[PDB]
Amino acid sequence: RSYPCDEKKQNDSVIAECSNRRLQEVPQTVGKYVTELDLSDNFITHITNESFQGLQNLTKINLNHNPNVNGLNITDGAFLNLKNLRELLLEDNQLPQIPSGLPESLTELSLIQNNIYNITKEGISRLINLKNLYLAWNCYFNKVCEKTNIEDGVFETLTNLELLSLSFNSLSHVPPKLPSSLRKLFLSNTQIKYISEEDFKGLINLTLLDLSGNCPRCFNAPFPCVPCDGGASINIDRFAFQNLTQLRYLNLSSTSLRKINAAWFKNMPHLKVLDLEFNYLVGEIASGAFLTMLPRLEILDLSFNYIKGSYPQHINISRNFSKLLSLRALHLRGYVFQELREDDFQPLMQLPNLSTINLGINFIKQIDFKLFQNFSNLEIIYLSENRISPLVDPHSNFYHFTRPLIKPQCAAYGKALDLSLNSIFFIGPNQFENLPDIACLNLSANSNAQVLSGTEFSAIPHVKYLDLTNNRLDFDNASALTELSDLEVLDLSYNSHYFRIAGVTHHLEFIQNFTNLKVLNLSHNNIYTLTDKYNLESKSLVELVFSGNRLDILWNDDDNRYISIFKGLKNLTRLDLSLNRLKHIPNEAFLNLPASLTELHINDNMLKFFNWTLLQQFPRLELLDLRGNKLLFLTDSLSDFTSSLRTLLLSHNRISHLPSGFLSEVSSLKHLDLSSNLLKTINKSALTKLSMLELHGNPFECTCDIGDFRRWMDEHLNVKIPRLVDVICASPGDQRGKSIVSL
Amino acid sequence: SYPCDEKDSVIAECSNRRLQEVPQTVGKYVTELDLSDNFITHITNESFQGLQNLTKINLNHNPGLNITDGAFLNLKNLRELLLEDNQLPQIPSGLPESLTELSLIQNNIYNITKEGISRLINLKNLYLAWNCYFNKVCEKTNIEDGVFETLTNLELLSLSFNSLSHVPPKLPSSLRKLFLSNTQIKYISEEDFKGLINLTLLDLSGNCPRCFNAPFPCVPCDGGASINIDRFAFQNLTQLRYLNLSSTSLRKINAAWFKNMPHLKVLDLEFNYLVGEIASGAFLTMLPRLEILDLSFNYIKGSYPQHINISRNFSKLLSLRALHLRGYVFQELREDDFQPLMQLPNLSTINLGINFIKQIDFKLFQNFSNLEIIYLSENRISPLVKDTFDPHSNFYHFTRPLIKPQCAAYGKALDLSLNSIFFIGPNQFENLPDIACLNLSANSNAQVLSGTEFSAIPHVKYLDLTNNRLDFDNASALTELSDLEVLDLSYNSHYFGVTHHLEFIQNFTNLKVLNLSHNNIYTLTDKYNLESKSLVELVFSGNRLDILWNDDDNRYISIFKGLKNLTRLDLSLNRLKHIPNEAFLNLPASLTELHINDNMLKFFNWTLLQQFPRLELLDLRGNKLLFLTDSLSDFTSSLRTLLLSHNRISHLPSGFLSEVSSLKHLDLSSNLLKTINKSALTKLSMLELHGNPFECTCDIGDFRRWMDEHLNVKIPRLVDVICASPGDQRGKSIVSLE
Ligand SMILES: *[C@@H]1O[C@H](CO)[C@@H](O[C@@H]2O[C@H](CO)[C@@H](O[C@@H]3O[C@H](CO[C@H]4O[C@H](CO)[C@@H](O)[C@H](O)[C@@H]4O)[C@@H](O)[C@H](O[C@H]4O[C@H](CO)[C@@H](O)[C@H](O)[C@@H]4O)[C@@H]3O)[C@H](O)[C@H]2NC(C)=O)[C@H](O)[C@H]1NC(C)=O
Ligand SMILES: *[C@@H]1O[C@H](CO)[C@@H](O[C@@H]2O[C@H](CO)[C@@H](O[C@@H]3O[C@H](CO)[C@@H](O)[C@H](O[C@H]4O[C@H](CO)[C@@H](O)[C@H](O)[C@@H]4O)[C@@H]3O)[C@H](O)[C@H]2NC(C)=O)[C@H](O)[C@H]1NC(C)=O
Ligand SMILES: *[C@@H]1O[C@H](CO)[C@@H](O[C@@H]2O[C@H](CO)[C@@H](O[C@@H]3O[C@H](CO[C@H]4O[C@H](CO)[C@@H](O)[C@H](O)[C@@H]4O)[C@@H](O)[C@H](O)[C@@H]3O)[C@H](O)[C@H]2NC(C)=O)[C@H](O)[C@H]1NC(C)=O
Ligand SMILES: *[C@@H]1O[C@H](CO)[C@@H](O[C@@H]2O[C@H](CO)[C@@H](O[C@@H]3O[C@H](CO[C@H]4O[C@H](CO)[C@@H](O)[C@H](O)[C@@H]4O)[C@@H](O)[C@H](O)[C@@H]3O)[C@H](O)[C@H]2NC(C)=O)[C@H](O)[C@H]1NC(C)=O
Ligand SMILES: *[C@@H]1O[C@H](CO)[C@@H](O[C@@H]2O[C@H](CO)[C@@H](O)[C@H](O)[C@H]2NC(C)=O)[C@H](O)[C@H]1NC(C)=O
Ligand SMILES: *[C@@H]1O[C@H](CO)[C@@H](O[C@@H]2O[C@H](CO)[C@@H](O)[C@H](O)[C@H]2NC(C)=O)[C@H](O)[C@H]1NC(C)=O
Ligand SMILES: Cc1cc(-c2ccnc3cc(Cl)ccc23)ccc1O
Ligand SMILES: Cc1cc(-c2ccnc3cc(Cl)ccc23)ccc1O
Ligand SMILES: *[C@@H]1O[C@H](CO)[C@@H](O)[C@H](O)[C@H]1NC(C)=O
Ligand SMILES: *[C@@H]1O[C@H](CO)[C@@H](O)[C@H](O)[C@H]1NC(C)=O
Ligand SMILES: *[C@@H]1O[C@H](CO)[C@@H](O)[C@H](O)[C@H]1NC(C)=O
Ligand SMILES: *[C@@H]1O[C@H](CO)[C@@H](O)[C@H](O)[C@H]1NC(C)=O
């Protein structure tokens, strides 16, 4: 049972996770099998060559973010002793120089987020084995350095280096004498404004070059941002990329480009991905000679090139876009225009493999929707934040938004259409005319107040994942959404009436009509009364999310009206009743929770009482989540009540005592969470296939009655007890603040 | 006193004290007993023995309630009895004839018997709303023939939210205000409102309602049928000021209805079907004295027409003060469409909210000589780039001011919140009247403020830009509005770790109030101070002072140091663990009021308050403070209001109150006191101790006596000043012991 680290198997070797653990030195209590040690995000101040003796087998050390709340003192030669150290991470250590005397065995080295202004032969030219060197965020609006000093030739002895990052450093010019072995060179945000024919000569293996953020489009710029003198673009020579025949990824985002020279791409037959955002390329997009040089481009990003001051009627697409045969995905966010006609997109209609058109953030008023019918492979039409009306971390892509445009779970069903954040205030009769067969539709946040009658989706009848969240939809009618007989996922989260005065009544009869509806999300609808029918009914449904509603009212109704709301959900396995303000649940109401349940969530309510006997009604229940409540006690024999429960979550409650023979002999129960409660000790009498037990944030009384518990922690090494550091003695005050393991 | 808080009359507040019976510990004086929101179950005639000079009793919201025969009869000076939310089956028998106002709202009273109320001849104001509705039970409210005709001094009768089906016969001529909203009447005969010549207000709303997209359950009349109202219904109603026909599903309005009614002042037609009537509008000629007209939410379902068709007969509305046209829904507003309103000499509010209007020929608001309030929220104006629940509430009318008073007070106010102005167009404000108060809130507006955008309306004094994505890192930003006094930039952030440059503030000659809450400000470029000689209030909540002041090179020790006229600073929600001692001392010594609440403060240097000689109010709530001096007097003598709610203070000196003198309000609620010392015990007027784990034996009784000794020092919420230890005591009020 490791301390303070969490050791464990990783593939075919053993790993010590020792982070966010307030340590002030390296531990010497580390397992002897460990080959990779993460000590990051801690209060460690000094490293000497003593700090990692008896761990010669180490391969990977991470000392990132040390310390938290001067710098990190690394005594020269501190690691030379580690003959198998391949990867060494030293980010955010406030270093003032590359550590002296680093071990030749290294292959990956990160020195990001330091105050290293000097790249010497003294520091790195001895590491002939480096593949991956990362030096970014080292001189970035640091008043000293005025400029990064790159000792000449420092890099040429690195004859096996494949990755060099120097982004967010003031370099003014490209370092000379870079090794032939490079495949990826990152020079983003380096105030490199001119690029010569010499700069990238002898890099015949380059697959990636990043020159983004030089001559920034510093307008609309979140961060500190010095645009070049005038409005000037980065200046890239005519033959700058001539010997770069392997280039696959080129990023020229935010280089203020107005024109694009087609000659840059004459010897680049494999360019796969080209980022051109935050530039001024509206003219170029209309003509675009360079589009003829890119038959293999798979991703083009031209987002946010809009002209300041302008909201022009139409977009203008070069016919040359048709010369983009390999194109998978086009990103045109924030060009900004009013009307999209069938004709404007003719070039793209032939491109065989085009699956993503991203047209977010253009404030487009009208789209001639029939155009999308002419694409044999659209999977993702993304029109968020437009104005359609009704019809009648330094390791992150800094400039191109990387997360999925549309949730996987939605997109997975088929064609995806995202009309979130438009002006669709009611669903017009012609709203979805001429649309291809949409499987996944997003109307979220349209101030949309439709009274659903079963006729509004008929033109796209096969939607399977509908997201309607954050509108004002009236689904009082029991015919509502029935025209979509294949619907599998409906999200009504955050739907209210166009007033948010309380008191709104709901009719939920439409639910029963669906024959393969699987997941329904009624969260935050502030549901306190159902009118006429008082039960939910569906043979299909599997998941119901009832969070953020007033079950509290519903279930204390004088007349027992809703004692059976969720019983007629006959196949349900997952029910979330969190955030419903519950103090006490009517024993009758709980016994009508449908017995098909596997996962019940009642967390974040105000329960003082929970009747454990009722879990006999639930022979297939595996996960009970009761966190964030006020409960005071537990049954003294849980095994009696259920023998199917695997996971029980009691963190953030008021429980002070663990009953005798409680854990004995539930057996069923693998994971039990008791953290953040009021336990002071754990009795000899309370002392199973339990494989994890959470106890952090409980005020303990060490010493001495606690000793029982300890020898239990030693004879049961199988019972993993996470987060030991945060299992803290409350008292006596001489122990206070210690782990209960310190003794 | 206990348990009532008691203060030409005398009011005992016994609201919300979890009382289970009418206290007998009630000062004989008391003429107003408020017992609402409690656990009271029975009211016998024992309950108000020797409380014989009571004027008013509230018993609302208890807890149904078992009130005995003639239980209130004893009380000869009782005028006002409120009995709302008491689950009563029937009106109480034996109510005192002295009553002048009764309320029986939210009960189960399905029968209006003479037995119950006909002997209450001094009644002036009767309320029986919300009793029979949405329940089986009763099928209909049984109202005894002639029950009201003996209440000849009755002025207001409210039966709203009951099922009546027809208006009650035999109503007393003295009625001035009859309320019949949501009562299920669908026809109004000539005879129903007969002889009621003193009526100033009639409410018939929710009768044949416009149900579809109504919040609460709602039932349109069979078919699409409106309420049917005889031609003459209102013939002998010449005195009416208020007519409420909201949600009556009206298509056609009979101008004859208003022949005899030349003083109607407020007409409400929200939630009807009157797009046709707004167009023709014969009834509009019968309203010379009308001041507030409301045609809101009459949109035709399906439709989103180009234009709004406004009858010329709108110009026969010479007394109109405020017109409400929300939810009409139309794409474009032409200058020509609002001609009829341009000669109305006293029109000051046009309300066009929630119409989804794409365009507005703005120059049209120049031909109106009294417009103070143009409210255009939730429309779709775009950047311009070209030259030329509670019973007693109003269900259908938006009661609250359309624009914050503080803004409108400066003059002509334009609200364009929740529109589509993503950047400020070059001609955005051309052809506007001289505008003092502007709301541009919630427009996804990403404009780069360069000091030229606002020049067409340069006399703006109040400007609201909250919930946008503005860039004001240029020092010229907004400086074209030299008369600017209030500027709100709360919840502005970059669209996607953003620098801020806050030099623009300094340029303003006359800027009173700057709000930058929730701007996640962690760094300032170039200049590290904020400078101004005008600014009186800065709000800096929801920013990252914690970063700026844990700054390794001390660049921000004097951020606010230069706001020389500052009296109110708000550093709430700044995640401040610690304040650097000197940085604290560099807060404008002009301060009257300092808020450092809802941070994470473990220590607070109580000495640095000698430096703040004007300080009246200090707010430290919701932190982690472990202790306090002990000698507050030494450190300041101006402090009137100290707020310590929600800290970890376990000791209370003991040199506190001996002597601070200056202090009028000390708030120690939700701390960790176990007791108040004997050494711990000259004027102060409110003390807040509830929420502490008090140790209830056998001291402190000294505090118990010190409460008796010092009666002046009001302590609120006694009932929640709770013994944590030891059960027995656990859960009792410290005033109960011996
Ligand atoms: C309305 O309510 C619905 C239904 O609850 C919500 O939609 C669900 O949202 C949840 C989370 O909010 C989703 O659950 C997550 O699915 C992710 C995708 O999993 C894929 O890969 C995994 C692993 O390889 C497979 O098991 C899986 O089948 C998928 O192939 C997971 O990445 C998430 O992981 C969770 O656990 C891990 C630990 O294992 C943690 O790191 C995470 O924190 C996390 O909890 C998770 O399981 C679910 O997929 C959604 N379903 C649907 C149908 O959309 C909506 O969010 C809600 N609406 C609103 C407005 O809130
Ligand atoms: C200019 O464009 C180029 C692309 O042409 C772009 O380069 C990309 O940089 C990102 C960010 O560094 C890389 O993505 C990472 O790849 C590394 C190695 O595979 C991973 O370590 C990263 O994963 C970490 O972070 C992830 C979340 O971001 C986590 O999932 C995970 O836990 C990791 O901790 C991440 O996957 C990417 O490899 C390159 N692209 C290529 C082809 O090499 C560059 O960023 C752009 N420049 C700027 C300033 O935007
Ligand atoms: C139909 O339209 C009618 C036209 O207004 C609505 O009648 C109004 O109903 C509301 C809700 O109950 C009443 O609100 C009450 O007003 C009185 C006011 O008393 C005085 O004191 C205040 C103090 O400042 C002052 O502002 C006023 O001018 C008064 O002189 C209060 O006792 C209540 O707290 C509450 O504010 C309106 O008073 C009433 N108007 C009139 C003229 O009687 C009616 O609500 C509409 N129907 C529906 C269903 O909404
Ligand atoms: C950004 O910061 C602004 C400045 O703090 C916020 O504006 C202030 O908002 C508060 C409420 O948060 C207002 O204070 C209230 O005003 C009312 C009005 O009282 C009336 O009667 C009193 C009698 O003394 C008179 O003095 C007033 O002038 C009014 O006639 C009070 O009744 C309340 O109790 C309370 O004091 C401020 O007035 C208001 N200031 C301004 C300039 O508007 C603003 O809300 C913040 N913005 C955001 C988005 O959070
Ligand atoms: C529908 O569109 C909305 C609006 O963009 C998406 O909501 C975002 O969801 C992501 C990931 O779930 C959140 O981190 C953001 O907070 C949301 N943004 C906003 C503005 O609310 C939503 O995910 C979309 N639905 C689907 C199925 O993809
Ligand atoms: C500008 O318009 C916004 C949007 O309507 C107003 O925001 C409201 O502010 C009040 C009180 O501060 C809140 O109770 C409401 O919830 C807000 N509404 C919304 C939709 O956010 C704001 O009051 C307006 N500003 C001025 C100066 O009048
Ligand atoms: C992507 C995007 C672009 C713009 C925008 C469009 C046109 N002209 C501008 C001028 C200025 Cl000074 C600032 C922004 C704009 C506004 C909002 C937005 O979300
Ligand atoms: C004022 C307002 C009006 C509308 C609206 C307009 C036109 N036709 C409709 C048809 C239906 Cl079923 C529902 C709503 C409408 C929607 C939202 C809103 O706030
Ligand atoms: C399109 O995708 C297929 C499947 O991967 C690929 O084999 C094909 O070569 C691609 N077509 C073009 C024109 O690049
Ligand atoms: C219920 O859904 C579960 C999936 O959770 C599935 O295994 C079972 O077949 C379904 N049965 C019915 C009748 O829907
Ligand atoms: C707990 O449930 C059992 C039925 O399993 C019932 O007899 C008992 O009344 C319940 N306990 C409480 C306190 O309601
Ligand atoms: C400072 O504020 C006070 C108090 O409102 C005001 O009287 C004075 O005129 C202000 N100073 C300036 C320079 O405007």
Side-chain angles (χ1 to χ4, degrees), chain A residues 714-725:
Chain A
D714 302 278
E715 285 178 351
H716 295 87
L717 299 176
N718 59 307
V719 177
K720 171 58 186 170
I721 296 168
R723 200 108 113 75
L724 253 11
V725 159

mmCIF file of all heavy atoms in Angstrom, chain A residues 714-725:
data_model
loop_
_atom_site.group_PDB
_atom_site.id
_atom_site.type_symbol
_atom_site.label_atom_id
_atom_site.label_comp_id
_atom_site.label_asym_id
_atom_site.label_seq_id
_atom_site.Cartn_x
_atom_site.Cartn_y
_atom_site.Cartn_z
ATOM 1 N N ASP A 714 -3.739 -2.841 6.654
ATOM 2 C CA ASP A 714 -2.532 -3.578 6.275
ATOM 3 C C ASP A 714 -2.799 -5.033 5.910
ATOM 4 O O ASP A 714 -2.120 -5.578 5.033
ATOM 5 C CB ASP A 714 -1.489 -3.488 7.386
ATOM 6 C CG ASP A 714 -1.110 -2.052 7.700
ATOM 7 O OD1 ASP A 714 -0.268 -1.474 6.975
ATOM 8 O OD2 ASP A 714 -1.665 -1.506 8.675
ATOM 9 N N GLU A 715 -3.778 -5.654 6.576
ATOM 10 C CA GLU A 715 -4.168 -7.047 6.277
ATOM 11 C C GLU A 715 -5.106 -7.121 5.079
ATOM 12 O O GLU A 715 -5.341 -8.206 4.533
ATOM 13 C CB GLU A 715 -4.834 -7.721 7.485
ATOM 14 C CG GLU A 715 -3.872 -8.127 8.593
ATOM 15 C CD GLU A 715 -4.587 -8.744 9.781
ATOM 16 O OE1 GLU A 715 -5.833 -8.692 9.818
ATOM 17 O OE2 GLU A 715 -3.905 -9.276 10.686
ATOM 18 N N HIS A 716 -5.656 -5.973 4.697
ATOM 19 C CA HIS A 716 -6.476 -5.879 3.510
ATOM 20 C C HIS A 716 -5.866 -4.899 2.523
ATOM 21 O O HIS A 716 -6.373 -3.791 2.326
ATOM 22 C CB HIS A 716 -7.872 -5.426 3.885
ATOM 23 C CG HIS A 716 -8.614 -6.410 4.724
ATOM 24 N ND1 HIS A 716 -8.519 -6.434 6.097
ATOM 25 C CD2 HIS A 716 -9.479 -7.393 4.384
ATOM 26 C CE1 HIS A 716 -9.293 -7.394 6.567
ATOM 27 N NE2 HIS A 716 -9.887 -7.990 5.550
ATOM 28 N N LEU A 717 -4.778 -5.317 1.894
ATOM 29 C CA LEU A 717 -4.104 -4.481 0.909
ATOM 30 C C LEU A 717 -4.889 -4.400 -0.401
ATOM 31 O O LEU A 717 -4.608 -3.532 -1.231
ATOM 32 C CB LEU A 717 -2.692 -5.010 0.637
ATOM 33 C CG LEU A 717 -1.739 -5.055 1.839
ATOM 34 C CD1 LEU A 717 -0.418 -5.693 1.427
ATOM 35 C CD2 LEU A 717 -1.491 -3.679 2.445
ATOM 36 N N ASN A 718 -5.851 -5.307 -0.588
ATOM 37 C CA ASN A 718 -6.690 -5.328 -1.799
ATOM 38 C C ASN A 718 -7.681 -4.170 -1.845
ATOM 39 O O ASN A 718 -8.034 -3.672 -2.919
ATOM 40 C CB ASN A 718 -7.454 -6.663 -1.921
ATOM 41 C CG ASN A 718 -8.367 -6.944 -0.721
ATOM 42 O OD1 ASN A 718 -7.926 -6.902 0.435
ATOM 43 N ND2 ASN A 718 -9.637 -7.245 -0.990
ATOM 44 N N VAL A 719 -8.124 -3.754 -0.663
ATOM 45 C CA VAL A 719 -9.074 -2.667 -0.535
ATOM 46 C C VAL A 719 -8.314 -1.398 -0.802
ATOM 47 O O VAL A 719 -7.637 -0.889 0.086
ATOM 48 C CB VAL A 719 -9.661 -2.599 0.877
ATOM 49 C CG1 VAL A 719 -10.600 -1.403 1.009
ATOM 50 C CG2 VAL A 719 -10.371 -3.905 1.226
ATOM 51 N N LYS A 720 -8.396 -0.919 -2.043
ATOM 52 C CA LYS A 720 -7.707 0.297 -2.450
ATOM 53 C C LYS A 720 -8.345 1.470 -1.730
ATOM 54 O O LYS A 720 -9.564 1.589 -1.703
ATOM 55 C CB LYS A 720 -7.777 0.483 -3.976
ATOM 56 C CG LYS A 720 -7.266 1.831 -4.499
ATOM 57 C CD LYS A 720 -5.810 2.105 -4.105
ATOM 58 C CE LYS A 720 -5.332 3.501 -4.505
ATOM 59 N NZ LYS A 720 -4.008 3.822 -3.892
ATOM 60 N N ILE A 721 -7.514 2.318 -1.131
ATOM 61 C CA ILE A 721 -7.988 3.489 -0.412
ATOM 62 C C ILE A 721 -7.305 4.704 -0.997
ATOM 63 O O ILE A 721 -6.163 4.996 -0.633
ATOM 64 C CB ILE A 721 -7.704 3.403 1.100
ATOM 65 C CG1 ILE A 721 -8.480 2.231 1.699
ATOM 66 C CG2 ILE A 721 -8.133 4.690 1.799
ATOM 67 C CD1 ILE A 721 -8.073 1.875 3.109
ATOM 68 N N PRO A 722 -8.013 5.422 -1.889
ATOM 69 C CA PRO A 722 -7.407 6.490 -2.664
ATOM 70 C C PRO A 722 -7.107 7.689 -1.810
ATOM 71 O O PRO A 722 -7.605 7.774 -0.690
ATOM 72 C CB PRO A 722 -8.504 6.852 -3.671
ATOM 73 C CG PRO A 722 -9.773 6.585 -2.946
ATOM 74 C CD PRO A 722 -9.477 5.380 -2.087
ATOM 75 N N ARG A 723 -6.291 8.598 -2.333
ATOM 76 C CA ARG A 723 -6.281 9.948 -1.821
ATOM 77 C C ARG A 723 -5.850 9.969 -0.347
ATOM 78 O O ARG A 723 -6.365 10.769 0.433
ATOM 79 C CB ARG A 723 -7.706 10.530 -1.984
ATOM 80 C CG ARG A 723 -7.792 12.047 -1.949
ATOM 81 C CD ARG A 723 -8.097 12.648 -3.302
ATOM 82 N NE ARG A 723 -9.409 13.299 -3.377
ATOM 83 C CZ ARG A 723 -9.713 14.489 -2.833
ATOM 84 N NH1 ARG A 723 -8.811 15.171 -2.105
ATOM 85 N NH2 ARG A 723 -10.938 15.008 -2.999
ATOM 86 N N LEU A 724 -4.904 9.102 0.027
ATOM 87 C CA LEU A 724 -4.443 8.981 1.443
ATOM 88 C C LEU A 724 -4.030 10.306 2.091
ATOM 89 O O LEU A 724 -4.505 10.661 3.164
ATOM 90 C CB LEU A 724 -3.286 7.967 1.572
ATOM 91 C CG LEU A 724 -3.565 6.595 2.209
ATOM 92 C CD1 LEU A 724 -5.050 6.322 2.400
ATOM 93 C CD2 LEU A 724 -2.925 5.446 1.436
ATOM 94 N N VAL A 725 -3.149 11.030 1.423
ATOM 95 C CA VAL A 725 -2.838 12.400 1.779
ATOM 96 C C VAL A 725 -3.998 13.168 2.427
ATOM 97 O O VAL A 725 -3.761 13.933 3.355
ATOM 98 C CB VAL A 725 -2.361 13.169 0.521
ATOM 99 C CG1 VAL A 725 -2.516 14.682 0.687
ATOM 100 C CG2 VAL A 725 -0.914 12.793 0.198
#
